[PDB]
From a paper:
Here, we perform structural and biochemical characterization of the [name] effector [name], demonstrating that it is a Ser/Thr kinase. Structural analysis reveals that HipSLp binding induces a loop-to-helix shift in the P-loop of HipTLp, leading to the blockage of ATP binding and inhibition of the kinase activity.
In this work, we find that [name] in fact shares sequence identity with the C-terminus of the E. coli K-12 HipA, the toxin of type II TA system HipBA, which is then confirmed by experimental validation and determining the crystal structure of autophosphorylated [name] (pLpg2370). Like other members of the protein kinase superfamily, [name] has a globular kinase fold that can be further divided into N-lobe and C-lobe. The N-lobe, which contains the P-loop, is composed of sheets β1–5 sandwiched by helices α1 and α2, whereas the C-lobe is predominantly α-helical and consists of helix bundles α3–α6 and α8–α11 and a short β-sheet β6–8. In agreement with our LC-MS/MS results, we can observe a phosphate group covalently attached to the Ser54 residue. However, unlike HipAEc and HipASo whose P-loops are disordered upon serine autophosphorylation, the electron density of the [name] P-loop is well defined in the present structure. [name] and HipAEc superimpose with a relatively large root-mean-square deviation (RMSD) value of 3.846 Å over 221 Cα atoms. Conversely, the six C-terminal α-helices of [name] and HipAEc, including the catalytic residues and some ATP-binding residues, are almost perfectly aligned.
Numbering used by the authors: -4 to 311
Write the structure that this text describes.
Amino acid sequence: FQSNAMKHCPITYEKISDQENYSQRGLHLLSPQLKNLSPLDLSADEQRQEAIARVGKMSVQGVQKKLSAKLKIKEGCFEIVDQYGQYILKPQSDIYPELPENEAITMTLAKTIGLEVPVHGLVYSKDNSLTYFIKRFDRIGHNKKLALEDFAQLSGEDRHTKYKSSMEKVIAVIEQFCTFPKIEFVKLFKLTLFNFLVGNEDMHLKNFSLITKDRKISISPAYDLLNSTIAQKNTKEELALPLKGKKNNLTKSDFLKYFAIEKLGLNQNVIDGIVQEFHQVIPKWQELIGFSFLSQEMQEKYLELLEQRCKRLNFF
């Protein structure tokens, strides 16, 4: 067949047999008592139509079509809902290729480098298409939602503002509102290097949010991370928001000196240690991309971009 076999778990990427759809460890990340995960009973097209119709009740922001869902643990399936959803589902786009598979692997790469990333993965659909899922990090069960505000709201911008900002304004939000800004600066540094390496030119203003939890206001867990470059036919920029006024032709010193030191004030030992973490993780990322549910064509685009971004930071 034209597709290469996909022999790993859509949640953990560990090896599984042909007769399994998910690893046991993956099912248990959803719930230790989940014994199976049935496919969604809607095709990709039906899922998109439902997302469009349910958008007024959708309490999670983001322009991509999304569905709210609960996990029915004893039955072993997702159920689409309007209220008290615990998961977000993202079906295949009708425009861009492999968005669920791309977001799934990219979030997994972010988790591998130590960023805070919620449980996520892929679930099969009625038509065999893969839908992305992520656990809500602002609600557990039917309890109160934790306070969550995106950086457009916090920086005084209109609700629709995504690209008319800058990294320096993102930094200013953290300085103004976070309980321990210097802890958050380390996260921002890792996130921004990560986004450069994986081709995420769509880390826009509304992809940063502050959550109020455990007596502190902090940058939220990661959400909506994708190699947006490989999903598009043409891109002219590397960053969604300028850094040092630049959205392309970023240099190693722009990230490791201007950003890390002049803007974030990180000490050299901290910078050096994080850079080494990225150096060490590259072979694991390459292996995971190979184990992913991306097509061979998209794996090749991911790996080619990753190699070029690593070279620009002198990784090798």
